[PDB]
Amino acid sequence: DFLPLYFGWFLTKKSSETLRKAGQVFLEELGNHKAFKKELRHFISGDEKLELVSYFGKRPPGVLHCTTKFCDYGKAAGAEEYAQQEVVKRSYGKAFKLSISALFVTPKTAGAQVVLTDQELQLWPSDLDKPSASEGLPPGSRAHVTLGCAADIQPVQTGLDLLDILQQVKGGSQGEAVGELPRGKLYSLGKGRWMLSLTKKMEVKAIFTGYYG
Numbered sequence: 001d002f003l004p005l006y007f008g009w010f011l012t013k014k015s016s017e018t019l020r021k022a023g024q025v026f027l028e029e030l031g032n033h034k035a036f037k038k039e040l041r042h043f044i045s046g047d048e049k050l051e052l053v054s055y056f057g058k059r060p061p062g063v064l065h066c067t068t069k070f071c072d073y074g075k076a077a078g079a080e081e082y083a084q085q086e087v088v089k090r091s092y093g094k095a096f097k098l099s100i101s102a103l104f105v106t107p108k109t110a111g112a113q114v115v116l117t118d119q120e121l122q123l124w125p126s127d128l129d130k131p132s133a134s135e136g137l138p139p140g141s142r143a144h145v146t147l148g149c150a151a152d153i154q155p156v157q158t159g160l161d162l163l164d165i166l167q168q169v170k171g172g173s174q175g176e177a178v179g180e181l182p183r184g185k186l187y188s189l190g191k192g193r194w195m196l197s198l199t200k201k202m203e204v205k206a207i208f209t210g211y212y213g
Helices: 013-032 034-038 079-083 086-091 157-170
Strands: 006-011 065-070 095-105 109-115 144-149 179-181 184-190 193-211
Touching: 006 013, 006 095, 013 034, 013 095, 013 109, 013 144, 013 179, 013 193, 065 079, 065 193, 095 144, 095 157, 109 157, 109 193, 144 157, 157 184, 157 193
Parallel strands: none
Antiparallel strands: 006 065, 006 193, 065 144, 095 109, 095 193, 109 144, 179 184, 184 193
């Protein structure tokens, strides 16, 4: 019996459209913000205005989702150990609400930061496959929804990018907001990294299950 490609929370069609539209408005607003335009050298590295919706053109097909454990059908480290957990089996097909507190952009990815409840954290993996940038931050800090990737970037980069942003925030390197968008304060973390801290958290409905590809 092989396992899914990955486990995670799959947004309902309505929630996925709502978050997808929010992400597009953020990308449009950010690309027009004077502070972002001034930093455009810290963002691209070759040779007017950059339309971030075109820049992050590899957008997830289907519904948006929040991965818990990438399994690659059993080939990833920790995959079989994760899937045999009681909580994974008990939650399979169950509905959850995911809290989105912030949207972010780097030169590689765009996504949404997810803040897991204590019940949802029980579904978060704990294994060797954990990357180093998750060290020093609370478990589950990687939890995100990918909104878009640059052409040569793989989607998994989005979670590594979020962790790197949260390492800045941990030490206060976000500083004061450089500005404001209609739905929250805008933070520049340097090196092409931007975070919109939402005035009001977004909530999305999602079903925990396995995706097979």
